[model samples]
Target: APRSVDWREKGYVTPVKNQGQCGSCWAFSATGALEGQMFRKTGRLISLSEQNLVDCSGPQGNEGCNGGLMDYAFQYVQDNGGLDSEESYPYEATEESCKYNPKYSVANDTGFVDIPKQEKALMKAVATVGPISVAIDAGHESFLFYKEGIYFEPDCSSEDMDHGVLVVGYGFESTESDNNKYWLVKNSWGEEWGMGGYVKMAKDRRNHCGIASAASYPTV
Candidate 1:
């Protein structure tokens, strides 16, 4: 890996998306990871469906439009053959009945692996595995309304995770020194939010917001 890596710049990441009023961040995270992995293999950036997971993954413990885990979502993908494109099974940002059909799938994954909850592991995974799906404590009021800047919550709690996002890259801003590192995370709140639906969090400071606590990446 280089001194810094941005999957967005490498054409491995899809555009930022909106999850609407639902707590379906997990679904978005799952597709984002799959989208990147698919690109790495086929050199095609196809948008996968979060709505597919939202609707069909209910049997695998995923509460559509409520909450879910990326691990279970990935397992659901592996068992379901693949995921349809966003255009085919677009997100409604709400719970809906199962409408998934494997025939419409545009991408698939063999399986996934959980990254060790460590900064080194997180960095390596993003460098080698492309974008990774991760959960964090987005319970903070500031976090929910975060706009811009290197988001460093000094009193940030790590275990109480409530949101899922994709870590696309890492590095300091133009002014910040190299030691002041941050992780570039892609959110599912629309491009109107933080740096176009993205945010930077302190990287070397105790896994700010538990960014490394629940990290995983899919295999194409």
Candidate 2:
């Protein structure tokens, strides 16, 4: 099961995906982060769609899905409602009809928590207890064109990210392929990216962009 994918050794587990150039990276990251956290909390590994977050999360930013806060996203799920399964919701990537299922149109109230502190705690908790939500700066082509393993963007500072994602786990790598040798990561782009739709930044840079500052929630 995805909940027991040995993330530490195998690295962050990403969702199955299909981003048809919506620039909704934030939405993708948010959904991916929570999917892991929910799976860890509930022990039910279901693929959550990022498109749902983009369409439903509400008033994020002007970049469509360029990036946003995962902490706020978790709260959105808690307050408005939890996410739907990939089967129930599914990812179209491009913005289209909401077609919200009443069974899926959640009115959740799990309540909001702090940003990254909550994220860290949840990640540690998930590792100790289960899975957790997480996010990082995926403002580069390396994020969009990822093929495998730890990677770093050549010039990502221009994107000005505020995105979100779930933290399946963390680890490091040794190779001449990429500079992003160490990372704390999760995904929203699906299983066609690095190590199956995942990205890795410099582990030392976790403190930047609130990557080390994400949060997670449980429905106990």
Candidate 3:
């Protein structure tokens, strides 16, 4: 793992949302991180629309959908203007019109980082900044598993899932696999989804295929 930070040790709270059934897990993860960070920094919990990032930050890689760069997403918001509340932007799990603020200067969303290094920065930043966006191997069990709080399902390979989520925190735990590092993640399959649309991915799941990427806040 590259330089890393333990964000949960800080003071950021997890987030909630629904991903429907799109492969846009990257979108949810990217926004969830920023929303959490925003909350930690401002004490305000506002829904940042994933659709806005998907449509607006287009013509670029990931196009805010499929697999995208979480850091770039944050920069996109800061450059063009910050993201609007979820209510204002809304989520269709597809593509739609993105309302850009003509008043603010185009956001400076230019930067990228690997998953491990990104993880380290997130842990450090969230300690002070807030939640960080993340994508992982959601596994197949996550397809139906739902509830509030944490839920550890059977071992799921990255090929089993192609979902994105928010990493509110991480910890040690035992599951279908041997003891492993786990990440506290928020999902988008409705509150009825896994741990209320949140699931845990193996922290040591670096080259675990599928679970190969993630990104988070504060680009400088």
Candidate 4:
């Protein structure tokens, strides 16, 4: 594909968020994906609460502050009616008892759609379906210390998923003799972490870090 896309420029993306010490990156990815669908459904872009998911999603198989799955988060939202706005239930970075209120809901998802395990399918979803919730094997020091440039960790395994992130866009940063294709990924580790809380991963490296293995999006 020659065309490139970035949802942030189209106003579908919210500001980069901080997940802090919590292993709630999946929650962030879920909210990010939900936020994108919510924005597309309505003309409004509002931040959703990860704390709401962190606290209320345990019944759906998501362990609070430890780890979770993006689809499990959507399942919780489907069962709970909706999700609270970040303004209503601000993140505390620590798990507390569920206190989600539908009255404070800013967005909701009926369920989710899965993207095929292929780069073209993944790219098509990100291009038209909005930001997608994706799982990755982020257990490498190289990934944690990443600053900028096209990131590719040879040590990471696609089957060993331990982190969740959002695939917001894709493009190639070409040089004179090389083409640096990348998936513009959004992380929850704060703005100081990588490229203002984002990472450009090796998009052309067929399923690198499981970027397309568990890709999905919310249905508003």
Q: How do the residues 1-220 of candidate 1 rate in per-residue lDDT, one tens digit apiece? A: 5578799998989889888898899988998999899998999999988888988987779988779999889989998998899999887878888888878999988889999999889998888889999999888778878998888776678888889999999875675564368899999999999889999988878778899999998887
Give the alpha carbon lDDT tens digit for every residue of 1-220 in model 4: 4378899999989899888888899999999999899989998999899999999999999998989999999999999999999999999999998898878998888988988888889998887888899999988999989998988898868778889999999997875534388899999988999899999988768688988888998888
Of the candidates shown, which would achieve the greatest TM-score relative to the real structure? 4
TM-score per prediction, in order, is 0.95, 0.65, 0.67, 0.96
Backbone clash numbers for all candidates listed: 0, 23, 23, 0
lDDT of 3 by residue, 1-220 (tens): 3233345445444346666655566777776666555655566656666777788876545654455666666666666656665666677788667775544322233333443544444455444444566555555544455453334445655444455566666666644556356666666666676664556655554434244444445442
Candidate-wise lDDT, in order: 0.88, 0.53, 0.56, 0.89
Question: Which ten contiguous residues of candidate 2 have the minimum total lDDT?
Answer: 1-10
Ranking by lDDT: 4, 1, 3, 2
Instruction: State the displacement of the C-alpha of residue 35, model 3, in Å, after optimal TM-score superposition.
Output: 1.3
lDDT: the better of candidates 1 and 3 = 1
RMSD of candidate 1 to the true fold?
1.5
* Candidate 2 or 1, higher lDDT: 1
Q: Give the lDDT of residue 68 in candidate 2.
A: 53
Residue 25 lDDT, candidate 4, scale 0-100:
92
Model 3 TM-score, 2 decimals: 0.67
- Ranking the candidates on TM-score from highest down gives 4, 1, 3, 2
- Give candidate 1's whole-model lDDT: 0.88
Best candidate, lDDT-wise?
A: 4
